Amino acid sequence: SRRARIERRTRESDIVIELDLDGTGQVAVDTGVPFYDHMLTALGSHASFDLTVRATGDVEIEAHHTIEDTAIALGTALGQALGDKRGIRRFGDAFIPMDETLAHAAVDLSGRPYCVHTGEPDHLQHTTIAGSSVPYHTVINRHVFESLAANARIALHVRVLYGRDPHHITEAQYKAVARALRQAVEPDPRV
Amino acid sequence: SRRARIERRTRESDIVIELDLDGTGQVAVDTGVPFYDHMLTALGSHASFDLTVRATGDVEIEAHHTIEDTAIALGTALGQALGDKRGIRRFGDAFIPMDETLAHAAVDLSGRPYCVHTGEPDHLQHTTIAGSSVPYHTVINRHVFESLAANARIALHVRVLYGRDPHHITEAQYKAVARALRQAVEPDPRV
Amino acid sequence: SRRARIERRTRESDIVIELDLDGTGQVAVDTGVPFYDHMLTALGSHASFDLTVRATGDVEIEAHHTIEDTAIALGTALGQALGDKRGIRRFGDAFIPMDETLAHAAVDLSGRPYCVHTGEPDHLQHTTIAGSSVPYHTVINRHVFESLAANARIALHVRVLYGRDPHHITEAQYKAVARALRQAVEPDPRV
Amino acid sequence: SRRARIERRTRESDIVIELDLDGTGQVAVDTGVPFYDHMLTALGSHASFDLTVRATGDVEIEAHHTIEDTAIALGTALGQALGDKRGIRRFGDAFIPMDETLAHAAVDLSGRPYCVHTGEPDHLQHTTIAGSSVPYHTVINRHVFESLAANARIALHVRVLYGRDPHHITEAQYKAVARALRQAVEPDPRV
Amino acid sequence: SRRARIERRTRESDIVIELDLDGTGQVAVDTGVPFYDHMLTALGSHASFDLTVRATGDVEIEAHHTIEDTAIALGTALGQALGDKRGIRRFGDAFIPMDETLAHAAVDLSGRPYCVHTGEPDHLQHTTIAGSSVPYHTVINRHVFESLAANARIALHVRVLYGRDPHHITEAQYKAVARALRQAVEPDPRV
Amino acid sequence: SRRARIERRTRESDIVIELDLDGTGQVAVDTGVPFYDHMLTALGSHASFDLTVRATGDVEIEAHHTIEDTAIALGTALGQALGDKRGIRRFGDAFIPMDETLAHAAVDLSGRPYCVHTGEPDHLQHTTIAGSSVPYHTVINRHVFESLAANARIALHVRVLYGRDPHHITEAQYKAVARALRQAVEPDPRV
Ligand SMILES: [Cl-]
Ligand SMILES: [Cl-]
Ligand SMILES: [Mn+2]
Ligand SMILES: [Mn+2]
Ligand SMILES: [Mn+2]
Ligand SMILES: [Mn+2]
Ligand SMILES: [Mn+2]
Ligand SMILES: [Mn+2]
Ligand SMILES: [Mn+2]
Ligand SMILES: [Mn+2]
Ligand SMILES: [Mn+2]
Ligand SMILES: [Mn+2]
Ligand SMILES: [Mn+2]
Ligand SMILES: [Mn+2]
């Protein structure tokens, strides 16, 4: 049984995560930042996790605090669910083509906490993805991966080999992390 | 059953493709362009497809029309054989070292049709691979991958990381696409 | 049964290798160069080999002759244990994140002998990893991979995508080769 | 007696080599690639070998497979004929002026397998030498020397110091290798 | 008879050299700097000298004084053994391929004392070759050749055409000098 | 018997050459240009020719016409003495260190007439070597080698790898040509 429930209450936000590593992509995310919900839903489904996330935070300011607190809580949940990490593949990686974009992630689940994020086009440091609700500033992508890695205590390397559309670039990175985690957490039939 | 038969008659060529995705590399290719036959035989074998290709076309002009019509027909056959794509891995990638050459392909079988082809040395835009029959102009490699992707309705990213010999560079790309497809079409035991 | 015992006596060194490709990471290495023992222990464990290496050589001069003779003997053992290579995956690759470092290896076990080694920072051509015993000059990393590839008769491509610490860069490369071999030697259930 | 007969049958080609290192330039080559036959005839004569080569292969594709299989077989034959290499000069080198072209080769017959090929003008990566039969793509020159070195298990360094005409550049390299081998295989009256 | 015995006692070291130019590579070297012993053993063997070197010096400081005093003594011995230089080839040169490295030496035994040393990679000015004993700083290679040339009273030109590994670069230079001397000291049947 | 006598009378000069290829360096040169006499004496001795040259010409103008007519006559004599060139080494090369200067020459005696002259420092296009008699303009060095090659009907490649002193650079080139010819004209015991 590789399950965790994390509750995180801060001045800024209130988070509940229910995570099962050995799921079928049963995923429900509600953070009040709908593009983020879309990215964490993609992450949960492509990782074949069962994942519920419920977060409420200070989105009057902007999404940053809620996004960061959610990624910290989600990282904590991944680390707790992995437990002793005995008998798992440990290493995982995935390429994700998305139209013009190619992204990649590699993970070491028994590595010390580390995040390297490279290749993201410079326009993603000031791009906003905006709809009818709270917008998502793509500059936070790096912060999400750093927060996940630091709190799950894993080595996570995210690369954008190339791309143009900020939605494609962002979504391909979340999916790549997801498929890299899925491979790494898998039981290893020889180890 | 993941099988397709495509017949394609144009002004320029007459093509028959019989494709089974769940094969053992039973492959027979005859297009009248022998280097192309070698590349599609490699593609069929390394993908563990069963594949018959019979093509006759206007090779008095050059191989281009026959090569393009064959890749369109083969793309159509791959898309038809994949059907609803339910329960498959969806994503696949492969590195192919071939002496001095390293090539890579990544695929998303449920992605919208897209092809990105990068890293091929500039001399491949005017190289000919010639023997005793109809020659193969390596400039067509990009056209083959674009045609396959557009007609199978998949995202296909082909990269040459480095290399020198045009036969090694070309063959490593066809093989990389082949092994990437093989992984992507595989049943996914969790999805 | 995919096992080899290689004995190699030269003017410079005396080597015994016992290798089983179908192991559980039962690994014992003693060469008189303790950082090398650490790298070959990582290679044996991450490849899920059973591996014993016993080497004595002219370390009064430096580690080079012992290191090279061991990699030649180990390459010979890998080639002999693979035998006819019937029914195996053939192709393998692995990414290894190690803190700030990302390394990659790709292999073709039925390729002609070839080694390409790229991306290693320039400071690794004159770095020493020194403890209380015989030191390890990181310039030899390339020589180890070339020797393994040439004597196993395989295509081996080792890349450092980025990194800083010479111990991380070296160890991530040995591990990447190890996991690439593990995937390549695996029985292929379709071929 | 320093003689070898090598038979090599692959999917692509059928090769027979009869080699005597202590010959008088009695040479007969037939591969179905007439410029290659000319180069291997030059190599056999200038090395003062007796050499017969009979090769049939898939020249409908192009010369590459036949050329590579022949150089592998010829390398194997050179290594087998050299046997223990006791009492030979070991080291050999030769300069070959050919009109505007100067080429050089150096060999170490007891060196580990290694090939360095430098100085060839960039136009030789896409040049064809074509007559009334199967053409010869000069990009393969490097591949021939690498194949010979890897299968004879020798160190072979081929340089083009300068030149223009692709036939002169190619022929001067084959001749330089030939005269370098002739010096290296010679009995050494002091060793 | 082309023999010399040189005894050299300085504040720093005590050297005995026994040299025969007309030897069979009967070589014994002991200087307390084991990589240097390896290089002078290679020099003695490849020159087909009979050579004994016994040196003890101030290796608590570093190898430099012992290395320099030995090369001065060895140069003196070569000059004394050559005597009047009547009837010898006078000129000699040798290429030495060593894996990735190519080195060359040319000599004029009746030239005025002169040494030109070129092409050595810049990392060799601060590289150490270290084992379990006294290390060898490759910056001294130039000093060794200058000392040999100045004390034998010969013109000696040492070149590194290319290379990477400091052990290969150093050893190929000592061997090249050795084979160049062997050719130059040979009786000339026409002069 | 490999001997020639050439008499050449032009408007500008009167030349007699007596050449024996199979000599012992019995050499006598008198052209009225004493530095040229020194260079042709070096060429004759180092080639182990027997050579007499007697030339009188229009040195009131400068040495050029006498120097060129002598090199044409000497080239003619070399070609006539070589006769059918049956059973000779054919190829020859030599490195000549001269203090700071290194020069090289390579020859093919059965090559079509060709001369390539490279590496000479730019100051040699306007340097004069002057004593108490008719001076020698080093710009003529290229012209001498071109004239020799064109009239002997040989391929001759002369290189200066480096140097400073115009007397050393010039003399090392004449000597290098000389030793290259000596090797090339030698009977070949296997051909
Ligand atoms: Cl990559
Ligand atoms: Cl050179
Ligand atoms: Mn923050
Ligand atoms: Mn989306
Ligand atoms: Mn088209
Ligand atoms: Mn092929
Ligand atoms: Mn080595
Ligand atoms: Mn470590
Ligand atoms: Mn090939
Ligand atoms: Mn020719
Ligand atoms: Mn000193
Ligand atoms: Mn050594
Ligand atoms: Mn003129
Ligand atoms: Mn002089």
Side-chain angles (χ1 to χ4, degrees), chain C residues 121-143:
Chain C
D122 292 331
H123 57 283
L124 266 78
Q125 287 181 23
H126 56 86
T127 287
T128 302
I129 302 185
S132 58
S133 185
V134 172
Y136 182 93
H137 306 297
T138 56
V139 69
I140 206 74
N141 303 337
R142 182 167 296 180
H143 198 3

PDB file of all heavy atoms in Angstrom, chain C residues 121-143:
ATOM      1  N   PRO C 121      32.672  18.095 -19.354  1.00  0.00           N
ATOM      2  CA  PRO C 121      33.365  19.382 -19.212  1.00  0.00           C
ATOM      3  C   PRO C 121      34.873  19.278 -19.406  1.00  0.00           C
ATOM      4  O   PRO C 121      35.479  18.283 -19.032  1.00  0.00           O
ATOM      5  CB  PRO C 121      32.994  19.775 -17.781  1.00  0.00           C
ATOM      6  CG  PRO C 121      31.614  19.211 -17.612  1.00  0.00           C
ATOM      7  CD  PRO C 121      31.688  17.858 -18.281  1.00  0.00           C
ATOM      8  N   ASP C 122      35.490  20.344 -19.910  1.00  0.00           N
ATOM      9  CA  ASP C 122      36.945  20.329 -20.216  1.00  0.00           C
ATOM     10  C   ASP C 122      37.770  20.105 -18.951  1.00  0.00           C
ATOM     11  O   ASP C 122      38.847  19.533 -19.109  1.00  0.00           O
ATOM     12  CB  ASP C 122      37.448  21.602 -20.904  1.00  0.00           C
ATOM     13  CG  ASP C 122      36.926  21.786 -22.331  1.00  0.00           C
ATOM     14  OD1 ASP C 122      36.648  20.754 -23.019  1.00  0.00           O
ATOM     15  OD2 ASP C 122      36.779  22.961 -22.745  1.00  0.00           O
ATOM     16  N   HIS C 123      37.296  20.464 -17.763  1.00  0.00           N
ATOM     17  CA  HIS C 123      38.154  20.315 -16.560  1.00  0.00           C
ATOM     18  C   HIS C 123      38.367  18.811 -16.279  1.00  0.00           C
ATOM     19  O   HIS C 123      39.321  18.484 -15.566  1.00  0.00           O
ATOM     20  CB  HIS C 123      37.662  21.126 -15.344  1.00  0.00           C
ATOM     21  CG  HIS C 123      36.279  20.883 -14.848  1.00  0.00           C
ATOM     22  ND1 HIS C 123      35.146  21.396 -15.504  1.00  0.00           N
ATOM     23  CD2 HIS C 123      35.834  20.315 -13.697  1.00  0.00           C
ATOM     24  CE1 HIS C 123      34.067  21.051 -14.831  1.00  0.00           C
ATOM     25  NE2 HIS C 123      34.463  20.396 -13.680  1.00  0.00           N
ATOM     26  N   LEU C 124      37.557  17.924 -16.843  1.00  0.00           N
ATOM     27  CA  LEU C 124      37.718  16.448 -16.589  1.00  0.00           C
ATOM     28  C   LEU C 124      38.902  15.826 -17.326  1.00  0.00           C
ATOM     29  O   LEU C 124      39.350  14.698 -16.941  1.00  0.00           O
ATOM     30  CB  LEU C 124      36.390  15.722 -16.802  1.00  0.00           C
ATOM     31  CG  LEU C 124      35.664  15.597 -15.469  1.00  0.00           C
ATOM     32  CD1 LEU C 124      34.993  16.891 -15.088  1.00  0.00           C
ATOM     33  CD2 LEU C 124      34.720  14.444 -15.414  1.00  0.00           C
ATOM     34  N   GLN C 125      39.542  16.564 -18.223  1.00  0.00           N
ATOM     35  CA  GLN C 125      40.764  16.084 -18.903  1.00  0.00           C
ATOM     36  C   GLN C 125      41.989  16.228 -18.009  1.00  0.00           C
ATOM     37  O   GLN C 125      43.025  15.694 -18.414  1.00  0.00           O
ATOM     38  CB  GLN C 125      40.992  16.843 -20.204  1.00  0.00           C
ATOM     39  CG  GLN C 125      40.004  16.405 -21.251  1.00  0.00           C
ATOM     40  CD  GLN C 125      40.217  17.108 -22.569  1.00  0.00           C
ATOM     41  OE1 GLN C 125      41.314  17.600 -22.872  1.00  0.00           O
ATOM     42  NE2 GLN C 125      39.137  17.150 -23.339  1.00  0.00           N
ATOM     43  N   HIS C 126      41.919  16.914 -16.858  1.00  0.00           N
ATOM     44  CA  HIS C 126      43.089  17.029 -15.959  1.00  0.00           C
ATOM     45  C   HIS C 126      42.664  16.969 -14.490  1.00  0.00           C
ATOM     46  O   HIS C 126      43.458  17.380 -13.659  1.00  0.00           O
ATOM     47  CB  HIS C 126      43.857  18.300 -16.302  1.00  0.00           C
ATOM     48  CG  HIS C 126      43.033  19.549 -16.250  1.00  0.00           C
ATOM     49  ND1 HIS C 126      42.840  20.264 -15.076  1.00  0.00           N
ATOM     50  CD2 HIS C 126      42.375  20.226 -17.199  1.00  0.00           C
ATOM     51  CE1 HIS C 126      42.084  21.328 -15.328  1.00  0.00           C
ATOM     52  NE2 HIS C 126      41.787  21.329 -16.613  1.00  0.00           N
ATOM     53  N   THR C 127      41.464  16.470 -14.175  1.00  0.00           N
ATOM     54  CA  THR C 127      40.984  16.336 -12.787  1.00  0.00           C
ATOM     55  C   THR C 127      41.509  15.022 -12.197  1.00  0.00           C
ATOM     56  O   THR C 127      41.512  13.954 -12.878  1.00  0.00           O
ATOM     57  CB  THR C 127      39.451  16.431 -12.736  1.00  0.00           C
ATOM     58  OG1 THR C 127      39.091  17.805 -12.962  1.00  0.00           O
ATOM     59  CG2 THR C 127      38.914  15.916 -11.414  1.00  0.00           C
ATOM     60  N   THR C 128      41.875  15.068 -10.926  1.00  0.00           N
ATOM     61  CA  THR C 128      42.189  13.843 -10.126  1.00  0.00           C
ATOM     62  C   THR C 128      41.174  13.686  -8.983  1.00  0.00           C
ATOM     63  O   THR C 128      40.878  14.673  -8.274  1.00  0.00           O
ATOM     64  CB  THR C 128      43.626  13.896  -9.604  1.00  0.00           C
ATOM     65  OG1 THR C 128      44.467  14.031 -10.752  1.00  0.00           O
ATOM     66  CG2 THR C 128      44.005  12.649  -8.849  1.00  0.00           C
ATOM     67  N   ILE C 129      40.667  12.479  -8.802  1.00  0.00           N
ATOM     68  CA  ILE C 129      39.866  12.132  -7.612  1.00  0.00           C
ATOM     69  C   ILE C 129      40.780  11.318  -6.703  1.00  0.00           C
ATOM     70  O   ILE C 129      41.218  10.239  -7.132  1.00  0.00           O
ATOM     71  CB  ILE C 129      38.619  11.366  -8.046  1.00  0.00           C
ATOM     72  CG1 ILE C 129      37.804  12.202  -9.033  1.00  0.00           C
ATOM     73  CG2 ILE C 129      37.794  10.940  -6.832  1.00  0.00           C
ATOM     74  CD1 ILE C 129      36.508  11.572  -9.421  1.00  0.00           C
ATOM     75  N   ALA C 130      41.183  11.907  -5.585  1.00  0.00           N
ATOM     76  CA  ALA C 130      42.275  11.377  -4.736  1.00  0.00           C
ATOM     77  C   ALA C 130      41.739  11.121  -3.342  1.00  0.00           C
ATOM     78  O   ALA C 130      41.198  12.000  -2.755  1.00  0.00           O
ATOM     79  CB  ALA C 130      43.425  12.349  -4.704  1.00  0.00           C
ATOM     80  N   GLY C 131      42.002   9.945  -2.802  1.00  0.00           N
ATOM     81  CA  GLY C 131      41.835   9.730  -1.362  1.00  0.00           C
ATOM     82  C   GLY C 131      43.109   9.214  -0.744  1.00  0.00           C
ATOM     83  O   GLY C 131      44.203   9.683  -1.110  1.00  0.00           O
ATOM     84  N   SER C 132      43.005   8.239   0.130  1.00  0.00           N
ATOM     85  CA  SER C 132      44.186   7.813   0.914  1.00  0.00           C
ATOM     86  C   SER C 132      44.968   6.755   0.144  1.00  0.00           C
ATOM     87  O   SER C 132      45.848   6.140   0.767  1.00  0.00           O
ATOM     88  CB  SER C 132      43.746   7.247   2.228  1.00  0.00           C
ATOM     89  OG  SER C 132      42.869   6.160   2.024  1.00  0.00           O
ATOM     90  N   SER C 133      44.547   6.386  -1.064  1.00  0.00           N
ATOM     91  CA  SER C 133      45.150   5.255  -1.821  1.00  0.00           C
ATOM     92  C   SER C 133      45.567   5.734  -3.230  1.00  0.00           C
ATOM     93  O   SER C 133      46.018   6.869  -3.389  1.00  0.00           O
ATOM     94  CB  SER C 133      44.158   4.135  -1.836  1.00  0.00           C
ATOM     95  OG  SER C 133      44.660   2.937  -2.433  1.00  0.00           O
ATOM     96  N   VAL C 134      45.424   4.872  -4.221  1.00  0.00           N
ATOM     97  CA  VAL C 134      45.839   5.187  -5.610  1.00  0.00           C
ATOM     98  C   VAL C 134      44.768   6.097  -6.185  1.00  0.00           C
ATOM     99  O   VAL C 134      43.618   5.709  -6.176  1.00  0.00           O
ATOM    100  CB  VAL C 134      45.955   3.893  -6.420  1.00  0.00           C
ATOM    101  CG1 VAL C 134      46.197   4.193  -7.904  1.00  0.00           C
ATOM    102  CG2 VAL C 134      47.012   2.926  -5.871  1.00  0.00           C
ATOM    103  N   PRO C 135      45.116   7.255  -6.763  1.00  0.00           N
ATOM    104  CA  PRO C 135      44.096   8.167  -7.285  1.00  0.00           C
ATOM    105  C   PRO C 135      43.586   7.763  -8.661  1.00  0.00           C
ATOM    106  O   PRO C 135      44.170   6.858  -9.322  1.00  0.00           O
ATOM    107  CB  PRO C 135      44.836   9.501  -7.294  1.00  0.00           C
ATOM    108  CG  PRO C 135      46.248   9.100  -7.628  1.00  0.00           C
ATOM    109  CD  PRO C 135      46.484   7.795  -6.902  1.00  0.00           C
ATOM    110  N   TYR C 136      42.492   8.435  -9.068  1.00  0.00           N
ATOM    111  CA  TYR C 136      41.765   8.169 -10.333  1.00  0.00           C
ATOM    112  C   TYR C 136      41.756   9.480 -11.120  1.00  0.00           C
ATOM    113  O   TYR C 136      41.256  10.554 -10.623  1.00  0.00           O
ATOM    114  CB  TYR C 136      40.341   7.678 -10.063  1.00  0.00           C
ATOM    115  CG  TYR C 136      39.514   7.321 -11.269  1.00  0.00           C
ATOM    116  CD1 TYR C 136      39.446   6.029 -11.771  1.00  0.00           C
ATOM    117  CD2 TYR C 136      38.803   8.290 -11.940  1.00  0.00           C
ATOM    118  CE1 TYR C 136      38.626   5.708 -12.836  1.00  0.00           C
ATOM    119  CE2 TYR C 136      38.010   8.001 -13.023  1.00  0.00           C
ATOM    120  CZ  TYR C 136      37.905   6.690 -13.482  1.00  0.00           C
ATOM    121  OH  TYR C 136      37.115   6.422 -14.575  1.00  0.00           O
ATOM    122  N   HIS C 137      42.410   9.450 -12.269  1.00  0.00           N
ATOM    123  CA  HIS C 137      42.453  10.602 -13.216  1.00  0.00           C
ATOM    124  C   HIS C 137      41.249  10.527 -14.155  1.00  0.00           C
ATOM    125  O   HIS C 137      41.200   9.593 -14.974  1.00  0.00           O
ATOM    126  CB  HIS C 137      43.772  10.667 -14.011  1.00  0.00           C
ATOM    127  CG  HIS C 137      45.010  10.663 -13.175  1.00  0.00           C
ATOM    128  ND1 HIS C 137      45.304  11.699 -12.273  1.00  0.00           N
ATOM    129  CD2 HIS C 137      45.990   9.733 -13.060  1.00  0.00           C
ATOM    130  CE1 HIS C 137      46.453  11.393 -11.670  1.00  0.00           C
ATOM    131  NE2 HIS C 137      46.910  10.221 -12.171  1.00  0.00           N
ATOM    132  N   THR C 138      40.323  11.495 -14.106  1.00  0.00           N
ATOM    133  CA  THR C 138      39.023  11.385 -14.830  1.00  0.00           C
ATOM    134  C   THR C 138      39.218  11.419 -16.352  1.00  0.00           C
ATOM    135  O   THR C 138      38.365  10.949 -17.090  1.00  0.00           O
ATOM    136  CB  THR C 138      37.994  12.435 -14.403  1.00  0.00           C
ATOM    137  OG1 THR C 138      38.574  13.716 -14.574  1.00  0.00           O
ATOM    138  CG2 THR C 138      37.528  12.246 -12.980  1.00  0.00           C
ATOM    139  N   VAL C 139      40.382  11.804 -16.812  1.00  0.00           N
ATOM    140  CA  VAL C 139      40.693  11.744 -18.258  1.00  0.00           C
ATOM    141  C   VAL C 139      40.504  10.310 -18.770  1.00  0.00           C
ATOM    142  O   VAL C 139      40.200  10.144 -19.981  1.00  0.00           O
ATOM    143  CB  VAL C 139      42.087  12.301 -18.558  1.00  0.00           C
ATOM    144  CG1 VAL C 139      43.185  11.410 -18.017  1.00  0.00           C
ATOM    145  CG2 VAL C 139      42.214  12.555 -20.047  1.00  0.00           C
ATOM    146  N   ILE C 140      40.670   9.313 -17.910  1.00  0.00           N
ATOM    147  CA  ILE C 140      40.562   7.877 -18.279  1.00  0.00           C
ATOM    148  C   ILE C 140      39.094   7.473 -18.526  1.00  0.00           C
ATOM    149  O   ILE C 140      38.899   6.418 -19.135  1.00  0.00           O
ATOM    150  CB  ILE C 140      41.217   7.009 -17.186  1.00  0.00           C
ATOM    151  CG1 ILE C 140      41.717   5.685 -17.740  1.00  0.00           C
ATOM    152  CG2 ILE C 140      40.242   6.777 -16.064  1.00  0.00           C
ATOM    153  CD1 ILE C 140      42.923   5.783 -18.556  1.00  0.00           C
ATOM    154  N   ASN C 141      38.095   8.250 -18.122  1.00  0.00           N
ATOM    155  CA  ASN C 141      36.682   7.823 -18.335  1.00  0.00           C
ATOM    156  C   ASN C 141      36.461   7.448 -19.808  1.00  0.00           C
ATOM    157  O   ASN C 141      35.918   6.364 -20.082  1.00  0.00           O
ATOM    158  CB  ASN C 141      35.621   8.838 -17.928  1.00  0.00           C
ATOM    159  CG  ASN C 141      35.643   9.320 -16.496  1.00  0.00           C
ATOM    160  OD1 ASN C 141      36.163   8.642 -15.588  1.00  0.00           O
ATOM    161  ND2 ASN C 141      34.961  10.446 -16.283  1.00  0.00           N
ATOM    162  N   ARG C 142      36.848   8.310 -20.725  1.00  0.00           N
ATOM    163  CA  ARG C 142      36.677   8.030 -22.161  1.00  0.00           C
ATOM    164  C   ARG C 142      37.332   6.692 -22.528  1.00  0.00           C
ATOM    165  O   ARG C 142      36.726   5.899 -23.289  1.00  0.00           O
ATOM    166  CB  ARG C 142      37.294   9.141 -23.007  1.00  0.00           C
ATOM    167  CG  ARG C 142      37.072   8.869 -24.485  1.00  0.00           C
ATOM    168  CD  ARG C 142      37.366  10.023 -25.404  1.00  0.00           C
ATOM    169  NE  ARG C 142      36.489  11.125 -25.175  1.00  0.00           N
ATOM    170  CZ  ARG C 142      36.543  12.264 -25.841  1.00  0.00           C
ATOM    171  NH1 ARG C 142      37.431  12.433 -26.808  1.00  0.00           N
ATOM    172  NH2 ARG C 142      35.737  13.251 -25.508  1.00  0.00           N
ATOM    173  N   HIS C 143      38.543   6.459 -22.020  1.00  0.00           N
ATOM    174  CA  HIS C 143      39.357   5.268 -22.337  1.00  0.00           C
ATOM    175  C   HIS C 143      38.620   4.014 -21.842  1.00  0.00           C
ATOM    176  O   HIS C 143      38.646   2.968 -22.478  1.00  0.00           O
ATOM    177  CB  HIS C 143      40.732   5.507 -21.733  1.00  0.00           C
ATOM    178  CG  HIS C 143      41.816   4.639 -22.281  1.00  0.00           C
ATOM    179  ND1 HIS C 143      41.616   3.746 -23.299  1.00  0.00           N
ATOM    180  CD2 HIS C 143      43.110   4.523 -21.947  1.00  0.00           C
ATOM    181  CE1 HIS C 143      42.762   3.146 -23.580  1.00  0.00           C
ATOM    182  NE2 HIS C 143      43.672   3.597 -22.777  1.00  0.00           N
TER     183      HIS C 143
END
